[PDB]
Amino acid sequence: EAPNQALLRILKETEFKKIKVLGSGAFGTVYKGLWIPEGEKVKIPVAIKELREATSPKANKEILDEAYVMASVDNPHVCRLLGICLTSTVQLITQLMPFGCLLDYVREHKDNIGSQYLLNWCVQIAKGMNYLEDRRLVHRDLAARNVLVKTPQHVKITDFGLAKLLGAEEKEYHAEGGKVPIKWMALESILHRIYTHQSDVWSYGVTVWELMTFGSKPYDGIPASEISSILEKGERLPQPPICTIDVYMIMVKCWMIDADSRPKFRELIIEFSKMARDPQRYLVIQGDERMDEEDMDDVVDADEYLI
Numbered sequence: 001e002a003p004n005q006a007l008l009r010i011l012k013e014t015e016f017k018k019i020k021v022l023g024s025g026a027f028g029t030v031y032k033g034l035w036i037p038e039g040e041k042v043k044i045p046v047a048i049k050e051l052r053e054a055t056s057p058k059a060n061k062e063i064l065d066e067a068y069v070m071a072s073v074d075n076p077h078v079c080r081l082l083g084i085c086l087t088s089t090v091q092l093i094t095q096l097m098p099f100g101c102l103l104d105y106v107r108e109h110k111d112n113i114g115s116q117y118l119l120n121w122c123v124q125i126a127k128g129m130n131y132l133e134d135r136r137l138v139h140r141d142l143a144a145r146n147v148l149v150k151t152p153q154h155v156k157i158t159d160f161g162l163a164k165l166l167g168a169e170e171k172e173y174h175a176e177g178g179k180v181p182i183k184w185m186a187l188e189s190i191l192h193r194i195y196t197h198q199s200d201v202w203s204y205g206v207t208v209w210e211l212m213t214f215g216s217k218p219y220d221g222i223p224a225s226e227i228s229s230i231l232e233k234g235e236r237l238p239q240p241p242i243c244t245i246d247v248y249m250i251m252v253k254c255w256m257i258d259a260d261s262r263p264k265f266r267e268l269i270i271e272f273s274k275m276a277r278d279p280q281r282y283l284v285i286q287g288d289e290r291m292d293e294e295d296m297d298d299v300v301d302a303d304e305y306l307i
């Protein structure tokens with residue numbers, strides 16, 4: 001394989017100002033704040049993320065593994081690691097995405113989201129995933145909760161805690177035990193713990209279903225242990241109301257038993273771009289046609305602060 005020359009930036013604690021808490025949950029604890037690289041008259045809004053646990057050595061081992069992957073990606077639809085802060089438990093720093101995750105976004109703004117925005121997000125998520133496929137990255141946890149919203153018109157993929165790099169001739173990742181989002185992974189992943197770029201496509205299919213249902217829960221009700229038996233009977237997630245058969249067929253295609261028969265990310269880009277050019281022909285939404293701080297002089301988004 002090729003040598004990974006990504007730069008792992010280490011950030012002084014004195015460089016972070018106005019750290020205010022952003023959220024807490026299974027993702028740990030996330031903070032909003034400002035990163036002021038010393039000297040540079042720039043104030044970059046950031047998000048800081050640690051662990052809702054203890055300075056357990058194993059926690060830092062997995063933190064620094066997500067750091068390794070996120071430090072190695074550079075794409076307009078993938079979140080990049082700005083750096084890490086070497087406190088007791090390692091903190092991961094990234095660009096602040098002010099509108100939060102796409103999952104909570106579609107849930108809160110159901111009555112104001114048009115087909116244009118929906119289809120555009122589908123293009124953008126597939127562009128980031130296609131980039132990850134170029135970098136030989138199996139995300140292994142694609143889901144609406146793991147897509148951040150910079151602006152309503154610009155979303156990016158995040159959360160690399162399960163991501164794995166495949167070898168130059170390695171085609172699959174065989175895993176071991178551990179909590180996995182079963183309602184998002186392909187059948188072969190649940191049965192044989194096999195992960196590929198085509199299993200990520202299955203996860204993409206569920207993620208798209210999440211957007212078209214405006215944030216519904218996949219297999220709402222069914223416990224996790226029945227999913228494998230349900231998918232083996234041939235059952236899949238239902239057609240969302242706003243979804244034409246054209247769109248729902250793309251979802252179904254992501255859920256083929258044959259992983260190689262599922263669409264490739266580069267194709268999902270093409271198909272959704274076509275649909276995004278006439279969005280009302282493919283999504284039917286009622287009313288579609290009709291759908292901080294005093295430190296700002298030197299604020300610069302992370303996308304405009306380059307090495």
Ligand SMILES: */C=C\C(=O)N[C@H]1C=C(C)c2c(-c3cnc4ccccc4c3)c3c(N)ncnc3n2C1
Pocket residue numbers: 022023025027030046047048049070092093094095096097098099100101102103104144145146148158159
């Ligand atoms: C979708 C549901 C949800 O509750 N999202 C919140 C939690 C997260 C993790 C988050 C981040 C975020 C994601 N990934 C990172 C990787 C390394 C370092 C830091 C992060 C932070 C986030 C960001 N970056 N901006 C805005 N809101 C964010 N949330 C909310």
